[PDB]
Amino acid sequence: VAFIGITTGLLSLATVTGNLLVLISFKVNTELKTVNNYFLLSLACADLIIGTFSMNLYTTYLLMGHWALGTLACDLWLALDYVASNASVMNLLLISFDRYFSVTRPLSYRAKRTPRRAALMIGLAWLVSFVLWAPAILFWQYLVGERTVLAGQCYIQFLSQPIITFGTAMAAFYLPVTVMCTLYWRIYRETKRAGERLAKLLEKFEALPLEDIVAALKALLATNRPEIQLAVKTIVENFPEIKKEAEKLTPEQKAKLAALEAQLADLPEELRKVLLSMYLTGLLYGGSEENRKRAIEKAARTLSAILLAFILTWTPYNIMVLVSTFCKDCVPETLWELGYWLCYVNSTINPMCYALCNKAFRDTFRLLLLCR
């Protein structure tokens, strides 16, 4: 009895503190306020809701023999839990979609979505989750012949619906569990091809004349497009960060970069900044097999970790409920509670595996924890 209560309280505390730290950090520093971080904030909020209102309350009901808090509390908690779970899944899928669209349509996407549009998408996903789950359960409880589950049980009565239960489960995980996979696979392919075509482009740049390069860049910049200005702004504002990576670059060819800067001394910002930030990135990430292979391996490992974690933690329920309306009483009731806990477990690891990786939170959260 002690083990069950000790393996649940610690998990709940970990999830709650992890998500609360992210939520505070998003409003504790001005550096993470970037629009790209809103999806992370929504995901952290959904995970916090799960960890603060479901894990503890489910452990309470599992420890004792019944959710004796009444027919109101049971239904309301159940609806809140399912809404939060689908909110987490939708936020993960949206993060995947943004990741895919940020590497295949760089200029177009970056220039075709600012602030409100992102908040609009997040709200749309939240509303989709709420409309899909929250209404149906309680409206069915009101419109069914009678609320007939058990005097002390809390499992949803919708579980016995071959056209609904299977349908809902598919539309909730079977679709995103494959869309995420396809999108991330395409991202891996396009980052391999990106390295290849960057190396080829860098070689051509090395062969190409410099004066023609400057003339072409100036001509392209003059015909300002909706997104070219945004790309110029991003590159110029990031340039100090890029230069820091120059030290990471080998000194074997530092003469080339120094010379290129020397001739680029004129045209201070419009040409020098972009030209250097382009040559440096090309040299550093095209290079040869030595660096390209390491980069692709690192990307693939990170992608595989992120995917596999969710895919393996969120299947202890999907398949067991797919069989449920397929093999009558095929599962042991003692096992059901394990997948139930595994879903929450996913909701716990998720902030750790999505937010810390950015490495701007990696130190900010620790500094906030130390209070200094």
């Binding site: 970056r110 960057l198 001509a219 392209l220 950015n358």
Partner: peptide
């Protein structure tokens, strides 16, 4: 020249792509 400008645009697009990958720590 036209082709040169096209290549320059491709290069700047690729630079933005590398920046975007860096910002996700998914490099």
């Amino acid at each position: 020249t036209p082709e040169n400008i096209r290549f320059v645009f491709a290069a700047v697009k690729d630079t933005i792509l590398q920046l975007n990958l860096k910002e996700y720590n998914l490099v």
